[PDB]
Structures are given as structure tokens and as C-alpha cells.
Design a protein around this ligand. Structure first.
Ligand SMILES: Nc1ncnc2c1ncn2[C@@H]1O[C@H](COP(=O)(O)OP(=O)(O)OP(=O)(O)O)[C@@H](O)[C@H]1O
Lengths: 458, 258, 86
């Protein structure tokens, strides 16, 4: 839903309100033109017949589209077809290189996401794209974006999952840009002090980026007062401390990332209490970390996504028992944290759905030794390579549990699954057969039914 | 019952339980014992031009009179005046919008010497005053908070109601729903339309819907008919009055203006 | 009377009393079943807590229906099992 409403906002179909996009999506849902579909309600899918009806309407309409997504295309369609259409979509293809320069004056929307072989494009590509508003090149193998000084109407750019090296100096000449997502960029090197040249950027995102605001010197986002959403990857304490100053920019940290952090032996949510928009919190390779403090101070932000990665020296995370800021947590992921020996506070996460854990070789159990089960909304738990994980947790009710996958956990002797629960939502269970046999069960019916109906061996 | 004045006027804002009040009162007259022989429900709101033929047809049908087509309107009015003058009638005029002579259409104006009572509803205090109802006037108050909340739930599906009704545990869904409901201000028409629009809401979109409704209701489905439903109160005014009226929207919400 | 009225493919809200159909209530034994393409129309008809989503057919039912729309000349080249052909 978020991608679609962003595209619509950039295209001008939304009057600067994401809620109207949500309402349009809901109206389409009510008319059965669309269907909600996904682990959450955040994702929608199109019925095949309705998709064909949309294509038929496009063919009968004046504004011709060039939509060829996921058709296993190894070569992009010739520029002759491009020259007349208004929206082009060649996403999720297998095209390698793009050579021609189309003469499309009328094109307003263009997508090139999920092409692994796309790495080279002709220079002067966007000279004719004078009417372009939405452009996407995410999940591709390109390294730099050619000269783009002619985008007099560009509003949305997103190069997520891209190996982009440096932003072009032509980008700062585009004053109509509003949305800029540069997340999961493991090859970014350009300085963001040049982002101050913009005036009307509403969204910026450097989440999980190889380069970001490492120190306060690069912190120059206060110039952009039009920003409302910022994604920051933090490398040093001083970035957080300077961000810990009262201004609307500080409160605009919806998603925050930590990578290769130095002088970050500790972190407190009280320091993050200035951030009332915080949802996503990601920590990676921040070895200098020792402990994490989750204070009882209920900040107006509602944390729901947290993930830890590669923290050998991190010992424990203190969580307030009676009430904690993680009561809104939806998913937890812990990876490569050998010194963690306190995760028991997970039992207080009533709203927890998805879990993925890998190679945290210090954890005893996810939950070690209201009148309701601790995880009634649980859907997924994944464990892998945990050498010291004796168990997951005590037996608890998981009415909505759907998938479980554990591999290479010799110490994992038992799982909280039991035949005392109701089972109509479970769909699959994955894992190794050897660990399946090594598990100890309180009832043999838990073995036969699961092993013959929902067990998928590796 | 106790009123010494036999013409009763009920007035309220647009869409605030009036016609519904008349319906419930009419259906409740069945249970109680009374000396009123005939109860007539007349909807004069069908026109601002006083569609007399329709009203005379309704009165004749409810009085077992033989309806005639070629009869002149004045003669039928006199005949109905004579006919209704021999019975104790309760006539529920619904949504009057302009003063109209009761005798001209055919309804005799009840007096203290007669036992008939005439209950009429209107959006305007002036209309109720013009019909000699000045000392039996009732202002239709909007619903209270508890009644508003109880009505709002009834317009939601069981899938959505399950995520809003529960007490004891506190979740942002209930607070957002209350914020949506309290924006309606207890107006039953507003409550109905808003609840119907958000009947199928999921847990995720309560935040965005609550945020938007508090500021602009224009994008909420069905609100166009709601505004067309009450628009007439605006169009009845002279352009000077209309321009003065929009001036009052300048001031802050939920405040008070000297 | 106790009436069962099957309104078919309603596309806009319409007052049941205006056309002449009394709205059934808990005090009455009548049931009114109505179908529509839109969730909004079903909600506007005070049916919010008796709503059924018409699910599409499954794979087996889809295949069984598809065969019934073929001539015996063509059905003979598709029905056989055991042996596999393109
Ligand atoms: N107590 C109530 N509970 C539930 N719904 C109510 C209540 N009172 C009124 N309504 C709703 O109010 C809506 C408008 O009908 P109502 O009789 O209140 O209009 P009104 O104020 O007389 O309007 P108008 O002046 O336009 O004729 C109806 O759809 C009805 O369901």
C-alpha cells in the first residue's frame, strides 16, 4: 500500500494526503476491483481477470500504456513503442543494458525495479522525460545515474537496494523533487551536505546505507524544513546527541539505523524519547555496544519493528516489566549476538507476530524460566545456528501461528507447540528432519499431525 | 397530554432525529389508551410549493373518504374541514419549511374548545412560531456521548466491532474510534453516515482515518449526500445571510464567538 | 406475512419502504437476502453483521467446470489421466 500511495502522491492524484490514497485503495477493495492479500493487511493484489480488464480498458483508452512486467524480458522493447505511451512499466524483468534514447514527451511514470542485470544506460536518457514525475530504479545492479538536469517535473525518486555510488550534481537542480529513498545502499559514497541545495524535499531515507550521517559534520538536514520523513543511518554517538535537541527535524526520525557504530557502548530510549515518530529500529555491526536500555517512559512513539545484527559485545537489554515501550512491537529479529543472555522480556510482547533469529550463541530461551497467552497474535518464528539455545519458551497459545522454521539447533530440545491448542490457521512448518526427531514432545499426536500435514523437510 | 395549547412544534438542526421522533411517537400511540380517533402522518416536506393534492389524498385515504379527481381543491378543503371537525384527530405534519394556511389545504386549526392535537416539525424556529405553536415548542437536543457511542457501534461489522468494543484492555483503536465518533457531535445523521463509511475498517487504518476525519470530512464516503441533505438550510437564506454564515467558519473549532 | 425476499445485484442504496418492502426487524420472522458487488452497498442496507464474501472457486472445481465447456471430440484429448500429454 505504501509504495502505491507514494506513487499516487507524486503523480498528483492525491492532494498532498496519504489518507486519500488509503481511502481510494479501500474503495477499490469494496468494489472487488482489488483484493487485500498478505501476512498483514498492508499488501494488496490484483485478480488476474480484473488485471486483464484493466489492460483492455487501457487498450480501449486514449492514454496508451506500455506495461510489460515480469514477462521474462531479456531485451527492453524498442524506443518506437515508447515514443507514444504515457506510462511505461518494465519492472521485474531480466534486461541487461538500455541503449536507445526515446523521444517520449508524454511519459509521466516509469518503473525499472527488480532487474538484476540492469547496470548500464545511455547518457542523456532523461532529456525527453520532461513530463516525468515518478521514476524508480530499485533492486538493480546499476552504479550511477546519468545526467538528469532536464527533469523539470520529477517528484519521486527511490534507489533502494541499489549499488549507487555517487549522486549527480544535476539532481540538486531539480526543485520539484519531494520523495527520495536511498535505503539498503551498500555502495553509497557521496556527501549529503549537497542535499541542502534542495528546497521542497518531503521524504529522505538513508536507512541501512553504507554511507550516511557518520558525524555531526555531515548533519545538515536542518536546512530542509520541508522534510517530514527522514531515514538516518548512524555511525557515531555525536550524531544521536546532536539529534537529541528539540526541533521538528529530530522528531521526524521515523526509521533509525545503526551501522559500524563507535563510542556506542550503550543506548537508551530516553535519548530517543524526543522521537515520537520512531517505528523502525535497526542495529548492525555496532560491536562497541554493551547494553540497551528500554525505559518505562512511554514515549508517544509506538515501536513495532526492531532488529539487531552483529553485536558480539552487547550483553543485555533492560526492559521495564510493568509497562514497556515494546508493547507495540510487531516483529523482533536478533542475529549474531553471542553475549545476549537476557531476552525473557519478549514474553511481555502481546502484539508480536514474526520472529527470525540466527546464530545468537548465548541465548538460553526466547522466554526463559493479563489473563491471556503471551503470543496470541504470533505468526512466525525462525531459528538457525543457535548453539546454546536450550529451548524457545514455555508452552503458550498461538492461535494464529502459521509458519515455523528451525535449522541446526542441537540444544533446542523442545518447542512450545502442543495439541492442546486449536489448529486451523497453520499452513506450513520447515526445518531439518534430524532436529525434528531430536525434539521432545509432550504428546505423540503433536508428531504425527504436524509431520504429515504441515512439515516441509529441507 | 398535559399541554393547555394543542399545537405542538418540534424543531432541531438538520438531520437530528426529528422525522424519526415522529415515527417513534406514532408507533407508541398504538400501545397507550387514548380518545384520539384518527392519527394522520403527513409529509409536507415533499415540496416548498405546498403540494396540496398529495396532502388531501393522504387525509382522504386515512379518513376512509371517497377520493375524487375532478373536485376543486377549495371544495375538497372545505369538505375535509367539515369532516375533521367531527373527530378528535392527531395530525403529524412532518418537516414544514414555509408557513401555510391549515384551512386552505383542508386541516382545521384546533382550538381549546376541541380535543384535537396537531404536532408539526420544522428546522426553523420562525416556522414553528408562525403556526401559533409558540408556547408548545420543543428543541430537539442532539444525542449524548453514551448514546452516540452506542449508535456508532451498531453501524460496524462484527469483524471491526471485535477490535473496538472490548474494555479493560486499552488499545489505540478504541481511542481513535471515540475520536471519530465525537467528531460527529451526536448528530444521528452524521453518526449513521460516518459509521457506515468506516464499517469495514481494519485495525491498521484507524489512525489515518481518525487523523483525517478530525480535519476534513470531505473525502469520507457518503458525506456528499449528507451535506446535500442539510444544504437546504443554507439555500433558504438571502445572499447577505449566506455570506455572513460562511464568515463564521473562520473562527477556531469547538470555541465560542462573541 | 413471513417473507423471504432475494434482492439481486443492488448497485445503489435505496429505501426499502419507498419501493414498498418493509424492513424486517427482530420482532418479525422475515429475512431479506440481498446481493451486491460493493461492500459499501451491503453496509448501507443495515447488513453489516450478516455479510458474506463470495469466494471464488477452487482449483478442483475450476477444472471440473472447465471440462463441461468442451465438446466430446476435444474432451477426449484432455480428460485421460495416467498417461501425460502436453
Ligand atoms: N435515536 C436514534 N437512533 C438512531 N438513529 C437515529 C436516531 N434518531 C435519528 N436517527 C437517524 O437519523 C436519520 C435522519 O432521520 P431523522 O428523522 O433524524 O431526520 P430529521 O432530523 O427529521 O431530518 P430532516 O429535517 O432532513 O427531515 C435516520 O437515518 C435515522 O436512522
Amino acid at each position: 500500500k505504501e509504495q502505491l500511495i507514494g506513487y499516487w502522491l507524486a503523480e498528483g492524484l492525491l492532494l498532498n494526503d496519504s489518507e486519500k490514497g488509503y481511502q481510494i485503495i479501500r474503495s477499490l477493495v469494496s468494489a472487488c476491483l482489488l483484493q487485500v492479500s498478505g501476512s498483514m493487511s498492508s499488501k494488496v493484489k490484483m485478480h488476474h481477470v480484473i488485471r486483464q480488464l484493466g489492460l483492455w480498458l487501457v487498450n480501449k483508452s486514449d492514454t496508451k500504456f506500455l506495461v510489460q512486467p515480469g514477462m521474462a524480458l531479456d531485451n527492453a522493447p524498442s524506443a518506437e513503442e515508447w515514443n507514444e505511451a504515457t506510462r511505461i512499466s518494465i519492472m521485474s524483468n531480466n534486461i541487461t543494458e538500455l541503449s536507445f534514447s526515446p523521444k517520449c514527451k508524454n511519459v509521466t511514470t516509469l518503473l525499472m525495479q527488480n532487474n538484476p542485470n540492469l547496470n548500464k544506460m545511455s547518457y542523456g536518457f532523461f532529456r525527453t522525460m520532461s513530463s516525468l514525475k515518478v521514476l524508480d530504479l530499485s533492486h538493480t545492479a546499476i552504479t550511477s545515474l546519468p545526467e538528469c538536469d532536464a527533469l523539470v517535473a520529477l517528484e519521486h525518486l527511490n534507489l533502494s537496494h541499489t549499488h549507487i555510488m555517487r549522486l549527480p550534481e544535476r539532481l540538486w537542480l531539480l526543485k520539484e523533487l519531494r520523495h527520495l529513498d536511498l535505503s539498503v545502499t551498500v555502495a553509497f559514497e557521496d556527501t549529503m551536505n549537497n542535499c541542502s541545495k534542495l528546497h521542497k524535499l518531503k521524504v529522505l531515507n538513508l536507512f541501512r546505507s553504507h554511507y550516511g550521517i557518520r558525524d555531526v559534520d555531515n548533519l545538515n538536514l536542518d536546512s530542509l524544513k520541508e522534510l517530514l520523513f527522514l531515514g538516518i543511518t548512524i555511525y557515531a554517538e555525536d550524531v544521536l546527541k546532536k539529534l537529541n535537541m528539540p526541533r521538528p527535524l529530530a522528531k521526524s526520525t521515523h526509521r533509525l539505523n545503526l551501522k559500524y557504530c563507535a563510542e556506542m557502548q550503550s543506548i537508551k530510549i530516553s535519548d530517543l524519547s524526543h522521537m515520537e515518530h520512531l517505528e523502525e529500529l535497526y542495529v548492525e555491526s555496532c560491536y562497541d555496544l554493551n547494553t540497551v536500555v528500554a525505559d518505562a517512559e512511554l514515549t508517544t512513539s509506538q515501536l513495532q519493528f526492531l532488529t539487531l545484527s552483529v553485536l558480539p559485545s552487547l550483553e543485555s537489554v533492560l526492559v521495564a516489566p510493568m509497562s514497556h515501550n515494546f508493547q507495540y512491537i510487531r516483529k523482533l529479529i536478533i542475529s549474531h549476538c553471542p553475549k545476549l543472555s537476557n531476552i525473557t522480556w519478549v514474553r511481555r510482547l502481546q502484539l508480536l507476530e514474526r520472529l527470525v533469529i540466527s546464530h545468537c550463541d548465548g541465548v538460553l530461551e526466547i522466554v526463559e524460566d493479563t489473563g491471556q497467552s503471551d503470543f496470541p497474535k504470533l505468526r512466525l518464528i525462525v531459528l538457525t545456528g543457535l548453539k546454546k539455545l536450550r529451548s524457545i519458551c514455555k508452552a503458550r497459545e498461538f492461535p494464529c501461528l502459521e509458519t515455523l522454521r528451525v535449522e541446526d539447533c542441537p540444544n533446542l530440545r523442545s518447542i512450545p507447540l502442543s495439541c492442546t491448542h486449536n489448529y486451523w490457521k497453520l499452513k506450513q512448518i520447515c526445518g531439518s528432519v534430524e532436529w525434528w526427531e531430536k525434539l521432545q514432545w509432550e504428546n505423540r499426536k503433536e508428531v504425527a499431525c504436524l509431520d504429515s500435514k504441515y512439515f516441509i523437510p529441507i | 397530554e398535559k399541554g393547555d395549547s394543542n399545537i405542538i412544534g418540534v424543531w432541531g438542526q438538520g438531520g437530528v432525529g426529528k422525522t424519526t421522533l415522529l415515527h417513534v411517537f406514532n408507533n407508541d400511540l398504538e400501545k397507550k389508551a387514548h380518545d384520539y380517533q384518527v392519527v394522520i402522518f403527513i409529509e409536507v416536506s415533499n415540496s416548498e410549493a405546498l403540494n396540496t393534492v398529495e396532502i388531501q389524498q393522504t387525509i382522504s385515504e386515512r379518513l376512509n373518504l371517497p377520493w375524487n379527481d375532478a373536485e376543486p381543491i377549495a371544495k375538497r378543503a372545505r369538505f375535509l374541514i367539515k369532516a375533521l371537525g367531527r373527530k378528535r384527530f392527531v395530525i403529524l405534519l412532518d418537516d414544514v419549511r414555509k408557513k401555510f394556511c391549515l384551512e386552505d389545504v383542508g386541516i382545521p386549526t384546533p382550538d381549546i374548545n376541541s380535543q384535537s392535537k396537531l404536532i408539526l416539525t420544522s428546522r426553523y424556529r420562525e416556522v414553528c412560531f408562525q403556526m401559533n405553536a409558540q408556547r408548545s415548542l420543543i428543541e430537539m437536543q442532539i444525542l449524548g456521548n453514551d448514546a452516540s457511542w452506542e449508535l456508532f457501534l451498531s453501524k460496524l461489522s462484527t469483524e471491526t466491532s471485535a477490535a473496538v468494543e472490548p474494555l479493560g484492555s486499552q488499545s489505540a483503536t478504541r481511542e481513535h474510534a471515540m475520536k471519530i465518533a465525537q467528531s460527529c457531535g451526536g448528530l444521528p445523521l452524521a453518526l449513521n453516515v460516518i459509521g457506515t463509511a468506516v464499517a469495514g475498517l481494519e485495525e491498521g487504518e484507524w489512525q489515518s482515518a481518525a487523523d483525517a476525519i478530525a480535519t476534513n470530512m470531505d473525502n469520507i464516503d457518503g458525506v456528499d449526500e449528507m451535506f446535500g441533505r442539510l444544504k437546504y438550510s443554507f439555500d433558504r437564506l438571502t445572499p447577505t445571510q449566506q455570506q455572513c454564515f460562511l464568515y463564521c467558519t473562520l473562527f477556531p473549532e469547538y470555541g465560542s464567538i462573541s
